[PDB]
């Protein structure tokens, strides 16, 4: 009974109220908690030595961010019980000749691309320099949100609808050894390591700026719209393959199994395995 | 009130073995590293950004943050053995000894001894010596062995004394503005050890050395938890003495420091842990 809408379906009042709430959460000090949580989990390797971490590059990538978004939406509701977390359906923006012309980058919502005169500092929209302070990898101020759409040779474009459809065909949620090299794995496909960077990883590299590296990515509010779409694609996968379940169920690295606590919380993947039990739904499901 | 935390020197040889056993299990399962990471992450979480205050140190939440830290750690201990509690290292009595390194807490059956200067002060005795206990660095990667170097600093050659503890218990205010290292007439800042620092809590970290000598890696040494168990005991004694003093600030402090603000990286507030008896544990001196 909580509907999360496509960004392009939002009214100008819904767009304004969401932007308003994020700014309030930022002013109170709640927003920075989520930046720090995401950076801390990126450093928590499972197990130490491997390149698996609690939030990425392993089987917990999807449930971790679902819990991440769940906690964020609850904090949104503390200020306004009418604001939900919209999702950025970037696979349809990619259909455009110039995806940077999408209304999600308008001055009334997320703001536009970075200014190459000012080292790609974003100077338009509610999160422009002077209105929205960022923190660096070390937790100290860094002086402004940056973006540089499609300025990389490994991610010049946004993922397509065909990329999403081909990932939904995968039968297994994940496969051993539950990491960057997992083949025939929906998790690793959606994450974007199969001929990477694609999908989730490509979207981060396409936006650039803080969004292009793990420890600083949540500095951009579009991080939450991005992962709201990733969580939707996962929820669609769970509906299609109704008789598949999370993997691994056991004997994976600690923090990756079905009932292990996900650092930095005690929440397990099972606790968030059914998003309707969490109290929200995506508009395409109705 | 139904769970007693004993002085380390009062433990039986069976209690010492079970505690060491449980900690090793928590390390093997992967739970122990969660506390290293939690402590490092909170040390980087400045409140507010720019200021010299973090969620776990250098401000009013220092004491309740570590109490919740110890509470969560003790619960994980009970999941493996529902009869093991968190003992405390009463370092104010070890300081009375001429050489505190001769204390039974550093025996091969418990914490092990001082570092070996031949091996760059790697600890080579006890259950946590190199080869039986792997450590992680500030970045979350293995670092290859616990180090200790007792009293090797010019600013903290000795352990704090009994008189240091008594003089801290005299302070009337829990904390004072601006709720940080410069707070004067503050029990919290006094106990932390920034009044003519390093003293008390801060001095103990500097005296042990090794990983214990810097914030992000300190929990790599299991004595980190025994140390803070004693800090939590002294606070609980202060709360009993000054029964009508309360946490400060109650409001209009930096977010994360007020009585009902969530303490990163949890949602726990200082009020949630303000009464340690309600949390389910008690110190043996209270009996
Ligand atoms: O912040 C991130 C950036 C990238 C780019 O690969 O991937 C994953 C992230 O969480
Ligand atoms: O973990 C810590 C390490 C040091 C070293 O001085 O001081 C204070 C701490 O809380
Ligand atoms: Cu992430
Ligand atoms: Cu991401
Ligand atoms: Cu600490
Ligand atoms: Cu300490």
Numbering used by the authors:
A (entry chain A): 5 to 290
B (entry chain B): 4 to 290
Which of the paper's sentences describe this entry?
Tyrosinases belong to the type 3 copper-containing protein family together with hemocynanins that serve as oxygen carriers, and catechol oxidases that are strict diphenolases34. Tyrosinases hydroxylate monophenols to form ortho-diphenols (monophenolase activity) and subsequently oxidize the o-diphenols to o-quinones (diphenolase activity). The two copper ions in the conserved active site, CuA and CuB, are coordinated by six histidine residues567. In this study, we elucidate the inhibition mechanism of these inhibitors by crystal structure determination of TyrBm with bound KA and HQ in the active site, along with biochemical characterizations, binding constants determination and molecular modeling.
We present here the crystal structure of TyrBm with KA bound in the active site at 2.6 Å resolution. Here, by modifying our protocol for ligand binding in crystal, we have visualized the structure of TyrBm with KA bound in the active site similar to tyrosinase substrates. In the active site, KA is stabilized by π-π interactions with His208 that coordinates CuB, similar to tyrosinase substrates, as presented by Goldfeder et al. and suggested in other studies. The hydroxyl group of KA is oriented towards CuA with a distance of 3.3 Å, while the distance of the carbonyl group to CuA is 5.5 Å. These results are supported by a recent docking study of Lima et al., and contradict a previously proposed inhibition mechanism of KA by copper chelation. However, the two orientations of KA, which are demonstrated by crystallography and in silico simulations, support the mixed inhibition mechanism, which is confirmed by our kinetic experiments. We suggest that when KA is bound strongly in the active site, the binding pocket is not accessible to substrate molecules, subsequently TyrBm is not active. However, when KA is oriented at the entrance of the active site, it restricts substrate entrance and product efflux, consequently, TyrBm cannot reach its maximum velocity.
